[PDB]
Amino acid sequence: PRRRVIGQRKILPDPKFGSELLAKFVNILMVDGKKSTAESIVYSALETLAQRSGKSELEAFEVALENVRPTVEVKSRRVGGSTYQVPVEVRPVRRNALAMRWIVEAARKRGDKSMALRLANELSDAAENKGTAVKKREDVHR
Amino acid sequence: VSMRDMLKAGVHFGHQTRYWNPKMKPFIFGARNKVHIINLEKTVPMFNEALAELNKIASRKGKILFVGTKRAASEAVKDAALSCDQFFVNHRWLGGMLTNWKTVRQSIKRLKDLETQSQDGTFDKLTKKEALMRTRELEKLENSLGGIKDMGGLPDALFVIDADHEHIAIKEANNLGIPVFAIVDTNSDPDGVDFVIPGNDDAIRAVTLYLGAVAATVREGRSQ
Amino acid sequence: NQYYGTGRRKSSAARVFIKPGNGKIVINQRSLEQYFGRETARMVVRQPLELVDMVEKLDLYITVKGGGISGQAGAIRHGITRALMEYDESLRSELRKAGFVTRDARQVERKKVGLRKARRRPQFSKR
Amino acid sequence: PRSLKKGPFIDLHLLKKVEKAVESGDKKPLRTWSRRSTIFPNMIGLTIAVHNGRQHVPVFVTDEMVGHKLGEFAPTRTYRGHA
Amino acid sequence: ARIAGINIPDHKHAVIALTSIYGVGKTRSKAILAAAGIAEDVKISELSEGQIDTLRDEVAKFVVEGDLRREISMSIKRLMDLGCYRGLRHRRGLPVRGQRTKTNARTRKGPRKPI
Amino acid sequence: GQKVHPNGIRLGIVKPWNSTWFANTKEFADNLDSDFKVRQYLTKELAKASVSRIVIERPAKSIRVTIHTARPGIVIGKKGEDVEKLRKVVADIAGVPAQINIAEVRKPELDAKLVADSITSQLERRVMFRRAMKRAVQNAMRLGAKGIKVEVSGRLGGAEIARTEWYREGRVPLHTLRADIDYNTSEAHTTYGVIGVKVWIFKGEILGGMA
Amino acid sequence: NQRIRIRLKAFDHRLIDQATAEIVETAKRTGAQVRGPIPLPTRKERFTVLISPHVNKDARDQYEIRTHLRLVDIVEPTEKTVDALMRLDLAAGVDVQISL
Amino acid sequence: AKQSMKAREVKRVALADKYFAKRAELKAIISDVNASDEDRWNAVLKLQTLPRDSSPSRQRNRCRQTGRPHGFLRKFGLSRIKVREAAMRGEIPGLKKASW
RNA sequence: CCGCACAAGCGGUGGAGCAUGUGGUUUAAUUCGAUGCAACGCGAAGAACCUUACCUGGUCUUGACAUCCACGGAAGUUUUCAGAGAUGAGAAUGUGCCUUCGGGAACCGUGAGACAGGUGCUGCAUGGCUGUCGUCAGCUCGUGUUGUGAAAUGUUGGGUUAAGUCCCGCAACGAGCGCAACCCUUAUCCUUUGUUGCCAGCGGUCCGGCCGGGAACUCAAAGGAGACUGCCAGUGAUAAACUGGAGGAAGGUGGGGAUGACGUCAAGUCAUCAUGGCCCUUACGACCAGGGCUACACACGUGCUACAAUGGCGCAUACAAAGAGAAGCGACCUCGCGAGAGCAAGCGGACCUCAUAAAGUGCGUCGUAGUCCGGAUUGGAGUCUGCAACUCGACUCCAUGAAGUCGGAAUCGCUAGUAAUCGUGGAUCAGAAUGCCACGGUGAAUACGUUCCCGG
RNA sequence: AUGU
RNA sequence: CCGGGCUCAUAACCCGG
Ligand SMILES: [Mg+2]
Ligand SMILES: [Mg+2]
Ligand SMILES: [Mg+2]
Ligand SMILES: [Mg+2]
Ligand SMILES: [Mg+2]
Ligand SMILES: [Mg+2]
Ligand SMILES: [Mg+2]
Ligand SMILES: [Mg+2]
Ligand SMILES: [Mg+2]
Ligand SMILES: [Mg+2]
Ligand SMILES: [Mg+2]
Ligand SMILES: [Mg+2]
Ligand SMILES: [Mg+2]
Ligand SMILES: [Mg+2]
Ligand SMILES: [Mg+2]
Ligand SMILES: [Mg+2]
Ligand SMILES: [Mg+2]
Ligand SMILES: [Mg+2]
Ligand SMILES: [Mg+2]
Ligand SMILES: [Mg+2]
Ligand SMILES: [Mg+2]
Ligand SMILES: [Mg+2]
Ligand SMILES: [Mg+2]
Ligand SMILES: [Mg+2]
Ligand SMILES: [Mg+2]
Ligand SMILES: [Mg+2]
Ligand SMILES: [Mg+2]
Ligand SMILES: [Mg+2]
Ligand SMILES: [Mg+2]
Ligand SMILES: [Mg+2]
Ligand SMILES: [Mg+2]
Ligand SMILES: [Mg+2]
Ligand SMILES: [Mg+2]
Ligand SMILES: [Mg+2]
Ligand SMILES: [Mg+2]
Ligand SMILES: [Mg+2]
Ligand SMILES: [Mg+2]
Ligand SMILES: [Mg+2]
Ligand SMILES: [Mg+2]
Ligand SMILES: [Mg+2]
Ligand SMILES: [Mg+2]
Ligand SMILES: [Mg+2]
Ligand SMILES: [Mg+2]
Ligand SMILES: [Mg+2]
Ligand SMILES: [Mg+2]
Ligand SMILES: [Mg+2]
Ligand SMILES: [Mg+2]
Ligand SMILES: [Mg+2]
Ligand SMILES: [Mg+2]
Ligand SMILES: [Zn+2]
């Protein structure tokens, strides 16, 4: 807003576990308020990943995230009065949001026979740090 | 009141002007410590003369308005005035206080109206916020108008702490032709005062001496 | 002995009765798990007992009507919180700090003239 | 369309005109304005001048058209191509 | 596998399969399967030849593809020849049951073409 | 910048209605039509009597009419001679027994409608509008000592180009709802056409509801 | 035994409350037995209409009519009660329905 | 609305009121399930003979005051423009602007 | 310096089909008005006849509609022929009523004029009403004050706000119209009254608040309470104000609504109505049937459903709000594959009916396909409203299965219970909602900041 | 660039 | 060349064919 700035809306923690990151994930996945569908898909993918690799569901998910978190951005701001594509730091909150959005985007493109499967394979690629999720980060860096 | 009392009270103090300025000359005894100094030998007579005229005013019993805008003196002028039951201004002198008194009258009317509402207690009719709002408005009106709300018209004579700080009131007094009794020092034209009091217009001790003498003069004159 | 509380959320309202017991709960003459197919609501309604760790010491009888499943869950939680504070007011502190005591007031916004929705304005046509 | 419980529909005056004509064997074209009247088998072989908003159009009844409405055989609009 | 008429149903669930026959919608398909007394979800494949024979018998009770096409053609020809308004519209390739011709008639008129 | 109707807003806050009969759907439209005809008639007859308003009720299958005028004598006639005729004819058109009551306007200056009617009357007699406006306005204060506004609009003085002009004195707080704004309009015909007139008359503040 | 049930409708809440006050006061002084005045849910009708005479779509306003309801029940209809409550008159704005 | 239109409407309502019972009776015959075919045929044939304006369908509501053929409300027998002015006058009992 | 102005986010429009408006073209006619924002699902909250103002043809001339005079008869009812109808012609019929006993009121017919009649022209002759800047923060007066005057000050300055809101300063002091407040609605509690609403504790029960009973609870609707920077800390010129904290259902205009200052656009409406004035009176008035307003190489605006596995299909099974109803809404039961039909209880409606919410959830199935996607188009066969569904209605069953696989330059909306998505009700209305006005269910992302724009 |  | 976009608009300038 031109006048001021305002804080970011607080979001509840998931009841199953309590990792607010997971709540933000289901939100960024949810479409047309079908929250239950989104959380179902998320749990299914998380299980089918964590019990085929890694030790723990939450920890595997988090590490997978960390492997894709970016650090720099290039989106232009008219700092010098013109649309300079100046590269500046990225907030850790914004880094998390960008990573999450990128990974969810990837799965929609992956095209396996189920969104749970697409999501699980994308997140496994992220945990393996070989996938388009890290690619978007490093292209931003480039 | 005598010369050494005035000296002890700081009535002889003054105001350095850069280099030399002829405006501040009228009562200069000289200068010391880079401060121009007033002649107290002249302080006594004119000061007493102003008091004498004020006493005559007191014998007449004509009202004396005591207005202070010089911040330090405001509470002292209020005290001195209320000691004699006289009117006072202890804030910024609102321009046109005499030339536009026609307007001032309405505020006195409305002040008394809201005060009557307070006595009635009928603010309790209003929604809670509006009751508090009217009380606050009445408080502001009391703050500003309390010193003149009983005056009923243009004052007969004016007491002024400092021509160097009350110059708008002096302007209006000259316009209407109202006698001014005031402290005059260097850096000030004396002609703005009908009965000049030579003496420093700043020092709080000097102000105290002036106000004590003036209030005593008012009460003694009205009691002859 | 018995304690009571009333809860509300959107268009839903709930009556809550609580008594010492092993911890069974019936809402509208059905079990909790039967009532809600979704499993989130089951936590949502139980959070206060979890918070004060009272799960197995109080028995609950519930009635609810109006609004949807989410709103009903929220109303039940609010009523449970109030009933708990009726049982033991010292719990009020942590209950408030958890955000359970506050009555959420958000409600739907009416439609308005010329607007397709609560705030949705029709397409401008570029002109 | 018209219910079957209702039965078909026809305007009375047309019915009498056609009945009288067929008894007489007059077989001259019949002026009429009843586009909404239905066709019955007996009218085969006749000729009806059917008003089309502007003019009464000649029409030669035949058994195929039985069950149709008269207005169905008299266009009311005109067209020949925009170009 | 073939049913009456030159049509090979593919090897999916039977109902979906049979619908292939021109003139057999979902309803007729269910009716045929019920008459033959065969579970609807069996594959076309794996049925005995006797079962396919009884199915060939079933479909005979309806107007078959090659005759259904001819029937429809004859009906439209009759209307066309009669000269009725509805028939006249058919020969002009225009909507025939009262839809606006100022706009939204592509499916009948075809793709647009400039003046 | 069109304004709302001052009376409409304050209905049920400080202003009561002009018709207070209960009805159901079947009765409703025809009741309204009957009332409309009743007023449209009484206004036609009582033009010279300086009538301001008519309030109608339908208690117990009977119509009761109360009329406000600045001089009852013109409408009451000698020994009630003609008001009886009004009663008869209103009973006829209403289709029910009728009852009449008279209330006496006491300050015709402080009635919006009477002021507007006077202004229109003077206009029809080629009076110069500014004079009429000023005299009315000044009268209002002389008697009521509270705010008033007036507007006029049309081909003033037969001017080729129509225009509008107005005059205000005192407080007229429209946006305020506590304000007892009396408002009305009236009509004037001329050789040149129509010249409208609207009037507002503030009369003080209501605290404690209409009750 | 008998019982009187009275339903009241109006557009002014204060007025209908006064009407119920008359009913209950008379029934009390005549020595009847009474169920208190029971409020019932009030219907409100709403109508939105286009303000402009010419074409100004999306410009308009809306009005409402609220009809209130009160109910009173009498379970000791002494005869001296029965007629007396038909001797009463109510303001034009109030509609009264009585039944046994 | 031209005077002729109101004349037409009043004539329609009156004439339609005249033949109400006869049309209802013939309708009862025409729709009867068990009625003889010939009787139904005759009943249908005769209905054509009545005046076309006898049918209630041909009527159109119009504003009582002005007779406008659009923007009608059955509740008031008036069109939108008229109702608003009257409401503003406050002549309609209990009506008020709606803000809920 | 401010605003979903840009930015950061989410979803669309622009390609497809269809609904709807407009331009153009066509026609006997496609009636009229509204064309940057601020015209185009607009007047019209609903054109088969009617409506209807247009076209063709058929008819009337003091008239369809009103007063005034004469004259003749109660009225009215029933029925026959001709004609598409308007009308024309006849039959029986009525044959009455107040009558001061004269007649009159009633109505109905003819004649005579004075007059009727107009959706005919002028919104640049006007009233009334409305849009627009814009819920933008401004617009002015009095007294005083300065300049020889034309005028200025107030209303600028330093802060601070949603704001000419507030404080300080200040040749100004005030006032008025705007701002805010007073009004409705929502969030918590208290009091009052408890049926047709309520069922915690009691008794009985076929287990149905079913009934005895209860007055607690929910709820109903009247009246009260409650939030003010009130409290604390910091900050600030001790100013105002800002930041944080406590308590509370609620915290800093708690949320939404109504409410539109002086004026701008000779903006819109002579077709709601009113009216100056010009124009037509066997016709620019009036009556009737059929036609048109729905046409169709094209262009444009606004919508609706789609191109799919967060999905399609089958089975089972949960949870709403707000409205409407007397020629009305219409259960139950019977009949039909179905739209429906028959019979017929109840309710002027907390009681009865409309009317079982859909998303959701449990099971199965489909396997990425022009498909178990999508449904347009066309054939056949029916129901219902209406005198009457050819032009030109809505709806059901069978069969048929277009285009379409995320859409260029470009462009719109939106800051929280919002966006997106899923259903329910109402008005207009015999019948005819993808439009319009309301109601609830589920329920997000993003805001670095003011540099660009756009506007003020 | 122009524009009643 | 024909159509769509940009503008209160016409030109210049973009996107199809
Ligand atoms: Mg719209
Ligand atoms: Mg058909
Ligand atoms: Mg307005
Ligand atoms: Mg109701
Ligand atoms: Mg109709
Ligand atoms: Mg953006
Ligand atoms: Mg296109
Ligand atoms: Mg398109
Ligand atoms: Mg047009
Ligand atoms: Mg005949
Ligand atoms: Mg004649
Ligand atoms: Mg005339
Ligand atoms: Mg104009
Ligand atoms: Mg113009
Ligand atoms: Mg504002
Ligand atoms: Mg400003
Ligand atoms: Mg100025
Ligand atoms: Mg200004
Ligand atoms: Mg400033
Ligand atoms: Mg102000
Ligand atoms: Mg100032
Ligand atoms: Mg029991
Ligand atoms: Mg109680
Ligand atoms: Mg209350
Ligand atoms: Mg507050
Ligand atoms: Mg402090
Ligand atoms: Mg400090
Ligand atoms: Mg707190
Ligand atoms: Mg706080
Ligand atoms: Mg509020
Ligand atoms: Mg306001
Ligand atoms: Mg125009
Ligand atoms: Mg016109
Ligand atoms: Mg016609
Ligand atoms: Mg049209
Ligand atoms: Mg859509
Ligand atoms: Mg399907
Ligand atoms: Mg229900
Ligand atoms: Mg039922
Ligand atoms: Mg059955
Ligand atoms: Mg329904
Ligand atoms: Mg399902
Ligand atoms: Mg099919
Ligand atoms: Mg294709
Ligand atoms: Mg794109
Ligand atoms: Mg919808
Ligand atoms: Mg309806
Ligand atoms: Mg309908
Ligand atoms: Mg919604
Ligand atoms: Zn000094």
Side-chain angles (χ1 to χ4, degrees):
Chain A
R2 177 193 289 291
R3 180 64 62 87
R4 78 203 67 73
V5 186
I6 64 171
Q8 315 311 77
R9 196 172 300 83
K10 188 270 176 183
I11 81 164
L12 66 79
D14 170 79
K16 187 176 180 181
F17 316 106
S19 63
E20 292 77 356
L21 185 56
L22 200 62
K24 180 72 80 176
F25 202 58
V26 292
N27 285 7
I28 183 67
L29 192 134
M30 155 149 89
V31 184
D32 308 58
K34 292 210 173 198
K35 182 159 278 182
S36 64
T37 322
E39 69 184 1
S40 82
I41 304 158
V42 160
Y43 296 180
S44 65
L46 281 183
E47 220 69 2
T48 201
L49 177 148
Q51 290 44 60
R52 80 171 189 190
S53 320
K55 65 183 289 294
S56 300
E57 212 171 359
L58 179 56
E59 300 55 17
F61 158 78
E62 298 164 337
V63 60
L65 164 55
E66 305 163 356
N67 318 132
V68 299
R69 285 180 176 156
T71 71
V72 58
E73 61 188 1
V74 302
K75 292 177 72 68
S76 176
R77 179 84 192 180
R78 297 187 58 109
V79 184
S82 289
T83 316
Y84 294 174
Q85 292 71 8
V86 64
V88 290
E89 60 173 275
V90 187
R91 304 270 51 68
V93 172
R94 189 161 179 80
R95 294 172 60 233
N96 295 283
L98 285 166
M100 299 174 70
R101 202 181 299 160
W102 301 347
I103 69 168
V104 300
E105 207 303 322
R108 286 169 166 70
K109 175 61 193 73
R110 191 178 193 111
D112 311 330
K113 287 299 206 297
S114 171
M115 191 55 98
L117 182 58
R118 274 109 61 181
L119 170 56
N121 288 328
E122 277 305 321
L123 193 66
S124 289
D125 284 354
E128 295 169 37
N129 62 77
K130 274 79 184 175
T132 173
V134 293
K135 187 56 164 61
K136 283 161 276 189
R137 163 181 66 193
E138 303 301 325
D139 299 350
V140 171
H141 297 189
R142 293 182 183 174
Chain B
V1 188
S2 290
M3 281 215 277
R4 285 298 200 231
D5 315 328
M6 305 162 177
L7 193 97
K8 184 270 296 192
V11 177
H12 64 301
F13 300 159
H15 305 265
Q16 51 169 344
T17 173
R18 282 301 307 178
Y19 292 33
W20 305 114
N21 169 233
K23 279 52 195 168
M24 317 190 175
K25 201 174 185 180
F27 304 113
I28 286 188
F29 161 88
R32 77 186 193 171
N33 309 320
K34 190 165 53 58
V35 173
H36 291 304
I37 297 298
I38 297 164
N39 189 289
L40 297 179
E41 174 192 10
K42 320 312 167 186
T43 288
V44 193
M46 310 302 300
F47 166 57
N48 300 358
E49 296 169 23
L51 297 178
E53 184 60 24
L54 289 171
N55 182 304
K56 159 188 174 182
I57 296 170
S59 64
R60 81 187 165 93
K61 303 176 175 52
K63 328 173 306 177
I64 300 287
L65 171 61
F66 299 88
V67 172
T69 77
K70 201 168 193 165
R71 196 282 188 178
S74 60
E75 60 79 28
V77 314
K78 172 258 293 192
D79 184 15
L82 79 87
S83 80
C84 309
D85 308 314
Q86 299 335 97
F87 321 111
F88 60 89
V89 170
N90 67 315
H91 305 287
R92 180 176 64 103
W93 180 258
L94 301 186
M97 183 176 282
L98 315 186
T99 66
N100 187 20
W101 155 263
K102 178 176 171 68
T103 298
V104 180
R105 290 162 61 195
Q106 285 87 81
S107 73
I108 307 313
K109 304 295 95 172
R110 292 189 291 164
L111 171 79
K112 292 174 183 186
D113 296 345
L114 290 179
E115 182 53 28
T116 308
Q117 203 64 0
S118 94
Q119 263 62 264
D120 296 338
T122 46
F123 296 127
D124 72 0
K125 172 63 207 90
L126 280 294
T127 290
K128 195 172 181 173
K129 187 184 293 183
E130 291 97 302
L132 178 59
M133 192 85 88
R134 296 289 73 74
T135 307
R136 288 176 169 177
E137 177 172 14
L138 172 59
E139 289 169 20
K140 290 185 183 177
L141 296 181
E142 281 280 30
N143 293 341
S144 55
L145 307 172
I148 62 162
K149 64 183 177 181
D150 300 326
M151 292 177 72
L154 292 187
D156 308 4
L158 306 185
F159 172 79
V160 156
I161 288 289
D162 178 19
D164 195 30
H165 203 316
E166 272 92 57
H167 94 82
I168 302 294
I170 290 175
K171 184 64 62 173
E172 293 195 66
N174 299 338
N175 186 339
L176 277 299
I178 308 301
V180 182
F181 297 77
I183 313 305
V184 178
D185 184 352
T186 67
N187 204 350
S188 188
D189 304 347
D191 63 7
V193 196
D194 301 80
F195 271 80
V196 63
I197 301 165
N200 178 260
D201 61 34
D202 317 275
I204 294 173
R205 314 299 173 73
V207 169
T208 301
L209 182 64
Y210 308 144
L211 287 172
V214 167
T217 293
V218 171
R219 281 178 269 107
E220 87 185 16
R222 190 163 59 208
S223 66
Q224 189 69 6
Chain C
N1 62 43
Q2 184 155 237
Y3 313 92
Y4 174 76
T6 296
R8 310 187 194 104
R9 172 67 165 114
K10 296 193 186 184
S11 72
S12 304
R15 305 156 66 239
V16 175
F17 298 84
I18 87 164
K19 181 187 290 284
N22 72 6
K24 69 197 78 44
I25 78 184
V26 64
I27 73 169
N28 291 5
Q29 315 306 142
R30 283 182 261 174
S31 88
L32 163 54
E33 47 295 11
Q34 292 159 322
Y35 213 95
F36 315 98
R38 284 164 70 181
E39 199 284 329
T40 74
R42 293 162 182 158
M43 292 70 77
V44 175
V45 300
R46 289 181 293 191
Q47 314 300 39
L49 285 299
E50 311 325 299
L51 192 43
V52 293
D53 321 329
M54 281 315 88
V55 178
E56 321 65 9
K57 283 76 61 170
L58 287 299
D59 250 353
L60 309 173
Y61 174 86
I62 323 290
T63 80
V64 65
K65 54 167 56 74
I69 67 170
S70 186
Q72 289 171 9
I76 304 150
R77 190 185 74 185
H78 184 213
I80 289 165
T81 301
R82 281 169 154 206
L84 285 167
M85 293 191 290
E86 306 321 324
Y87 164 73
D88 168 312
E89 55 305 353
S90 68
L91 310 179
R92 172 166 260 268
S93 184
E94 57 268 38
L95 266 52
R96 183 164 270 275
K97 288 198 292 269
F100 298 162
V101 175
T102 200
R103 166 68 154 105
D104 185 344
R106 295 178 292 166
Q107 292 172 342
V108 178
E109 301 305 20
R110 59 163 288 191
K111 191 192 164 299
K112 302 181 186 72
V113 180
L115 301 203
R116 302 202 178 296
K117 209 151 159 273
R119 295 193 181 174
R120 183 58 152 91
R121 164 171 281 81
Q123 176 159 301
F124 185 76
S125 78
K126 324 153 292 184
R127 303 181 166 173
Chain D
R2 193 167 187 76
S3 285
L4 274 297
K5 296 173 284 288
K6 184 64 66 67
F9 174 97
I10 175 168
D11 277 351
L12 173 51
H13 55 268
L14 172 44
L15 194 156
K16 284 329 327 173
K17 290 163 86 85
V18 59
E19 188 279 332
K20 182 184 297 186
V22 57
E23 320 330 300
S24 68
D26 52 355
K27 54 162 281 313
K28 297 326 300 169
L30 286 82
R31 295 168 71 261
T32 181
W33 285 266
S34 186
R35 299 170 81 73
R36 69 198 196 171
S37 62
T38 303
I39 307 169
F40 284 101
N42 62 7
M43 293 184 286
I44 297 150
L46 306 186
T47 52
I48 315 299
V50 183
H51 187 240
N52 74 341
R54 270 164 46 172
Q55 196 279 317
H56 287 81
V57 173
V59 173
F60 195 110
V61 182
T62 72
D63 43 358
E64 306 54 9
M65 293 182 286
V66 172
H68 292 228
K69 300 268 206 159
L70 271 288
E72 195 184 307
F73 306 92
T76 66
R77 296 194 182 81
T78 305
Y79 182 83
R80 323 180 201 90
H82 281 306
Chain E
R2 171 172 173 238
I3 323 290
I6 316 287
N7 310 69
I8 62 184
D10 82 355
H11 299 289
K12 297 187 301 195
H13 290 207
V15 175
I16 322 294
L18 192 73
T19 58
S20 305
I21 298 175
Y22 180 83
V24 181
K26 185 92 151 83
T27 311
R28 285 186 189 268
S29 185
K30 282 182 167 286
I32 292 281
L33 271 283
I38 292 170
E40 72 306 349
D41 65 348
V42 302
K43 278 258 299 204
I44 290 305
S45 55
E46 293 177 350
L47 282 285
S48 74
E49 171 56 340
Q51 287 169 317
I52 310 181
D53 300 347
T54 188
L55 290 168
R56 292 169 180 103
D57 315 344
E58 278 302 321
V59 317
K61 296 178 285 182
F62 311 149
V63 60
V64 55
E65 309 201 336
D67 321 329
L68 178 58
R69 295 178 200 286
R70 215 172 316 89
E71 179 286 339
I72 303 157
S73 57
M74 201 36 48
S75 84
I76 294 170
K77 167 58 190 32
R78 183 190 75 96
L79 283 169
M80 281 275 297
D81 188 358
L82 156 54
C84 79
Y85 155 86
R86 180 161 56 118
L88 268 291
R89 293 203 73 71
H90 262 291
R91 58 177 76 173
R92 284 190 172 182
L94 302 160
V96 187
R97 50 190 72 185
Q99 306 102 328
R100 78 199 288 135
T101 76
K102 192 183 181 181
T103 75
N104 289 351
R106 314 323 313 178
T107 194
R108 197 72 169 158
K109 292 174 72 174
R112 293 183 210 82
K113 54 152 281 293
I115 69 179
Chain F
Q2 296 65 245
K3 293 60 165 167
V4 71
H5 194 288
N7 199 60
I9 302 295
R10 298 169 180 73
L11 278 163
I13 327 178
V14 296
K15 300 302 196 191
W17 288 261
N18 287 309
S19 316
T20 73
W21 49 258
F22 191 102
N24 300 94
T25 309
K26 308 179 78 167
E27 188 74 30
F28 201 83
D30 36 2
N31 274 4
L32 292 170
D33 203 23
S34 310
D35 316 340
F36 155 81
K37 292 173 183 294
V38 159
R39 284 180 172 104
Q40 179 277 7
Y41 164 76
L42 294 173
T43 193
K44 185 63 68 67
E45 310 316 291
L46 305 193
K48 312 313 300 180
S50 59
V51 58
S52 61
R53 66 187 295 226
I54 297 159
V55 303
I56 319 182
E57 306 177 324
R58 311 179 159 292
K61 300 292 91 178
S62 76
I63 194 172
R64 181 167 60 204
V65 182
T66 304
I67 310 183
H68 294 73
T69 74
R71 50 183 180 193
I74 305 303
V75 83
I76 199 167
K78 184 174 65 179
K79 206 70 64 173
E81 178 270 340
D82 58 348
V83 57
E84 172 51 26
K85 308 176 191 182
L86 305 180
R87 190 205 63 72
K88 293 185 198 304
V89 68
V90 304
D92 158 6
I93 69 184
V96 291
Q99 178 182 3
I100 320 293
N101 291 322
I102 312 294
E104 189 169 42
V105 178
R106 203 153 302 89
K107 306 181 178 176
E109 304 73 4
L110 313 179
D111 163 347
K113 193 159 213 316
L114 302 180
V115 172
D117 316 321
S118 184
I119 302 151
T120 53
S121 80
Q122 294 149 270
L123 271 293
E124 286 162 347
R125 296 165 281 142
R126 278 73 62 210
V127 175
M128 202 24 49
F129 52 81
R130 199 74 193 86
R131 197 178 310 288
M133 302 196 349
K134 283 171 156 295
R135 58 186 52 277
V137 170
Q138 67 188 4
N139 301 313
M141 310 275 178
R142 293 184 308 87
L143 301 80
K146 203 63 57 173
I148 169 162
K149 176 182 170 189
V150 178
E151 309 197 353
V152 184
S153 324
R155 293 171 69 176
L156 315 190
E160 187 66 10
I161 293 166
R163 77 177 186 277
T164 179
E165 66 79 9
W166 66 278
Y167 189 57
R168 166 162 53 218
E169 294 300 348
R171 301 193 44 62
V172 194
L174 298 184
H175 277 55
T176 313
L177 308 173
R178 287 173 179 168
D180 219 302
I181 300 294
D182 187 21
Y183 167 83
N184 221 307
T185 72
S186 147
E187 194 56 85
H189 302 75
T190 69
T191 311
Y192 309 109
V194 187
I195 309 179
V197 178
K198 324 181 189 178
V199 178
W200 307 252
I201 309 178
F202 189 41
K203 314 186 178 182
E205 221 64 34
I206 326 302
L207 314 169
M210 42 216 288
Chain G
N1 187 25
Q2 294 191 343
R3 177 274 300 286
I4 318 298
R5 189 165 278 193
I6 306 94
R7 285 172 72 222
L8 299 169
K9 292 195 289 178
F11 309 143
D12 173 334
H13 75 282
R14 195 178 296 103
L15 178 61
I16 190 172
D17 292 344
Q18 287 158 356
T20 62
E22 330 316 313
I23 308 314
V24 70
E25 288 162 27
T26 55
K28 285 269 65 178
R29 70 176 180 74
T30 187
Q33 184 59 286
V34 185
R35 309 303 294 156
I38 284 163
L40 292 177
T42 75
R43 172 182 192 171
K44 63 192 74 77
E45 301 66 350
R46 284 179 173 145
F47 319 89
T48 168
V49 287
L50 286 172
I51 301 181
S52 172
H54 202 214
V55 296
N56 277 300
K57 199 52 175 295
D58 301 0
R60 72 191 72 180
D61 66 7
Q62 333 176 13
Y63 310 89
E64 99 171 50
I65 318 168
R66 310 152 85 113
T67 191
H68 311 263
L69 284 152
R70 304 291 184 263
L71 178 147
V72 176
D73 183 316
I74 311 296
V75 297
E76 171 37 40
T78 320
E79 154 36 70
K80 65 176 182 173
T81 304
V82 172
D83 36 358
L85 294 323
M86 273 74 86
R87 308 290 58 78
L88 297 56
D89 174 327
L90 287 305
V94 179
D95 174 39
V96 185
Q97 198 305 310
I98 304 177
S99 190
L100 167 51
Chain H
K2 315 198 288 188
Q3 297 302 93
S4 55
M5 293 318 170
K6 314 164 195 171
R8 292 190 212 170
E9 167 295 346
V10 63
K11 184 148 79 81
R12 270 160 193 163
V13 54
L15 156 54
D17 168 331
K18 194 178 83 84
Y19 292 107
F20 171 68
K22 192 179 196 74
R23 281 184 85 94
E25 289 333 330
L26 208 65
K27 284 278 195 171
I29 307 310
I30 286 172
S31 71
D32 194 356
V33 63
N34 54 26
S36 174
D37 85 88
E38 173 48 26
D39 309 352
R40 260 181 269 151
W41 178 245
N42 302 159
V44 160
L45 280 167
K46 185 264 286 181
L47 202 79
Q48 309 183 15
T49 70
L50 306 194
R52 307 187 91 179
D53 256 348
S54 59
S55 56
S57 77
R58 281 169 80 89
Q59 304 175 116
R60 188 98 191 215
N61 301 293
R62 300 179 167 276
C63 181
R64 282 182 186 224
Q65 307 302 341
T66 63
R68 195 177 189 260
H70 280 300
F72 182 68
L73 277 63
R74 296 171 190 214
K75 185 82 170 199
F76 314 124
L78 306 170
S79 82
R80 49 199 187 68
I81 319 180
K82 302 285 105 179
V83 48
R84 201 206 162 192
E85 72 213 3
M88 262 95 70
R89 288 71 177 276
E91 312 169 48
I92 301 170
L95 182 44
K96 192 171 63 179
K97 291 203 74 166
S99 63
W100 70 82

